[PDB]
From Swiss-Prot, chains C, E:
Disulfide bonds: none annotated. GO terms for cellular component: extracellular region. Residues 1-121 form the Avidin-like domain. It comes from the Bacteria. It comes from Streptomyces avidinii. This is Streptavidin. The chain holds residues 39 to 159 of 183 of the full protein.
Length: 105, 7, 121, 105, 121, 7, 7, 7
């Protein structure tokens, strides 16, 4: 259910392939991550995460979340965006937010 | 994340 | 390539990370014991052309907590900066998401910080 | 624009009074916080935050975000929910998420 | 009431916090200098009946970065636990939101950790 | 936050 | 993250 | 938060 093209709610497009053993690969820029390739059958979503380094914006975002299947499939996430900074500015180097991905724009 | 705005 | 090698926290987690030439991070989480049964794949990305004025190197990685023996139905991402030198660090924030029902999805993600060092505590 | 009743997207109801000098008071349980009582006139939202201690669930949530005015007024937030735990479990004591508040259910 | 008093980070911020009997936190951020021009109001809540088995006390507070002289159009919330004893701490995570346009709202919130101690560094 | 579910 | 404690 | 640096 994960392999394919995903759209966030702000324009962005995520093309991902989910490998049999847990790999996520694709493009957002190169993306790579991992997912639970044997999720529970108890109604739980499928845990996952991926990273894109923005190379050059000297920064990288990680998305952490879960895939939820069905007619209205979603990947529900929260993200951290860290910029390369001086040590003086390191305290303010990470932004946080959320993204909801769906199979249609 | 608004990627296009960030880059 | 100062990222490549073994990194620890003061909880003493252990990660062995290889940084590839154009931005790939690969490697593993290893238990204190270091056996396959507690080993998990790590993958991520880093800025392979950071500013060379003392600024940090932006990076991130993910571990999904499934291997050939165990499955915690969860995954953690770490987001942060590598800083080199005699007291090298990877300074991070992490998000740990568990697979949950839709009713519990609101409480699926834990957050915290992690400071990694090259020196085993 | 802040004073009044707000609804998140999951049921919850937030009754708040914004005082002239930056105080937020009300109920969610008692709520208290602060807001920028002289926001910029450059299209920026109004920064704010508040806390509710859940007394007893031995926990407290902080919401951090901004008020955006107009016909479709919103308070857009992200939250941290910390539980009281043993030291052994402190590493996993804080959940993160987001909430969008609107003036209608 | 072990929460009440002055708390510091290793960035050395200074917060003076008063914990009221049934759950109120009040007080101020104070600059290194301690003048009114860099003083900001803090308000929050804490669990006034925590487990008494050594567990932490859940709490949170907010500072909006406006006073009678300055306005940084932003506010920080800290969420965490008070732990008492000889090496008392308030262990927290924070969210710092700036007022932004709707187009920049996506990048309005910074995150990090803060460890508070009673001992001025 | 789903408050009613938490409490 | 206390990985050993989580697993 | 480095408050002194932010303000």
């Amino acid at each position: 259910g994960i392999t394919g093209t995903w759209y966030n709610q702000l324009g962005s497009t995520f093309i991902v392939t989910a490998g049999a053993d847990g790999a996520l690969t694709g493009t957002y820029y190169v993306l790579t991550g991992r997912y639970d390739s044997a999720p529970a059958t108890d109604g739980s979503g499928t845990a996952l995460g991926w990273t894109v380094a923005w190379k050059n914006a000297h920064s990288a975002t990680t998305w952490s979340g879960q895939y939820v299947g069905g007619a209205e499939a979603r990947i529900n996430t929260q993200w951290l965006l860290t910029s390369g900074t001086t040590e003086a500015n390191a305290w303010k180097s990470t932004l946080v937010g959320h993204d909801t991905f769906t199979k249609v724009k | 994340m608004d990627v296009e705005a960030w880059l």
